[PDB]
């Protein structure tokens, strides 16, 4: 191509990028972003902590996980503590009132 600046459109250079998404058979890979919000406390709330979906009141904790553990469970196996991914603090999960 001998490109020259005084060429009619359709003879001027265009730059092209071709994105090709492929899906072999791995376990996963790149995906789109996920927006979040602000964590509230002391109110019966509907929460999602990077996968953990639940409901209840959130409260500041005083337990100490090991620095690879995300959430804590009770005997009889119910989630009762979580760790906030962004600030990395432990929060207890109590149910909101019924009776």
């Amino acid at each position: 191509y001998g490109f020259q600046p005084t060429n009619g459109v359709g003879y001027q250079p265009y730059r092209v990028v071709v994105l090709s998404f492929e899906l072999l058979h791995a376990p996963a890979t790149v995906c789109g972003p996920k927006k979040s919000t602000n964590l509230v406390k002391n109110k019966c709330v509907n929460f999602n902590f990077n996968g953990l979906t639940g409901t209840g009141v959130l409260t500041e904790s005083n337990k100490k996980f090991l620095p690879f553990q995300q959430f804590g469970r009770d005997i009889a196996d119910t989630t009762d503590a979580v760790r906030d991914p962004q600030t990395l603090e432990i929060l207890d999960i109590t149910p909101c009132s019924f009776g």
Partner: antibody, heavy 120, light 111 residues
Framework: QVQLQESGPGLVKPSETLSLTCTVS????????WSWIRQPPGKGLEWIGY???????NYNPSLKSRVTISVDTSKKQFSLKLSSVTAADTAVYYC??????????????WGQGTMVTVSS | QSALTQPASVSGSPGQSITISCTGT?????????VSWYQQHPGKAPKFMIY???KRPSGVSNRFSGSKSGNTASLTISGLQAEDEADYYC??????????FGGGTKLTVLG
């Protein structure tokens, strides 16, 4: 397959507006470019504008300010109107296609022209 | 709104080869390679020959070849057959967004 075919008269005196059309035979409007090409007697060729189909244009500034091309896509026509002729434009007039998509360029199937004399 | 350049008639004997030139500025033929050739028989309509300095479209003999050096292209015929006596024009894509045609060259097969 596809062929071209001229139309239109020519014998008008000097200093008027002539017209020509190039109705398409095999049917290929709306995809290419179509242009008009002059040729005086015994001399070399020349060139005038073209008209895409959707949009349009005109060209050859030497002949600019005199020529207008129009297209009727329904019945597949090119009108060409030059104005205020000068009896120096006494020539044959071909209407060759053009070619894009597959680059090529240059031109392609022509149309047997039309002797167009300009005088009294 | 000017013109290109080409020699007038050339000569040649059958069976040989011949090369016809087409010289232009380095703003039309130098700065591009969209040149094409056209063969016109007397009192006929010109016929499309090869686009892009060389590329006989499916339908033309293989005795024709196109080439370029720099703002100068040329067309070579091989084994001159005495039916190629015609006129040959070259065209290109001058700047300013326009095309241009040569001056024509009468081929003489030296009957």
């Amino acid at each position: 397959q596809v062929q071209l075919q001229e139309s239109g008269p020519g014998l008008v005196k000097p200093s008027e507006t002539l017209s020509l059309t190039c109705t398409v035979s095999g049917g290929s409007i709306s995809s290419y470019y179509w242009s008009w090409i002059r040729q005086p007697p015994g001399k070399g060729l020349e060139w005038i504008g073209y008209i895409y189909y959707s949009g349009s244009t005109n060209y050859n500034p030497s002949l600019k300010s005199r020529v207008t091309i129009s297209v009727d896509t329904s019945k597949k026509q090119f009108s060409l109107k030059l104005s205020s002729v000068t009896a120096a434009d006494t020539a044959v007039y071909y209407c060759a296609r053009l070619e894009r998509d597959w680059p090529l360029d240059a031109f392609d199937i022509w149309g047997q022209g039309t002797m167009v004399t300009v005088s009294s | 709104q000017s013109a290109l350049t080409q020699p007038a008639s050339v000569s040649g004997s059958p069976g040989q080869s011949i090369t016809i030139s087409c010289t232009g500025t380095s703003s039309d033929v130098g700065g591009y390679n969209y040149v094409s050739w056209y063969q016109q028989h007397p009192g006929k309509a010109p016929k499309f020959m090869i686009y892009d300095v060389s590329k006989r479209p499916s339908g033309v003999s293989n005795r024709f070849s196109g080439s370029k050096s720099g703002n100068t292209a040329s067309l070579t015929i091989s084994g001159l057959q005495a039916e190629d006596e015609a006129d040959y024009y070259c065209s290109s894509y001058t700047s300013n967004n326009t095309f241009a045609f040569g001056g024509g060259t009468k081929l003489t097969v030296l009957g």
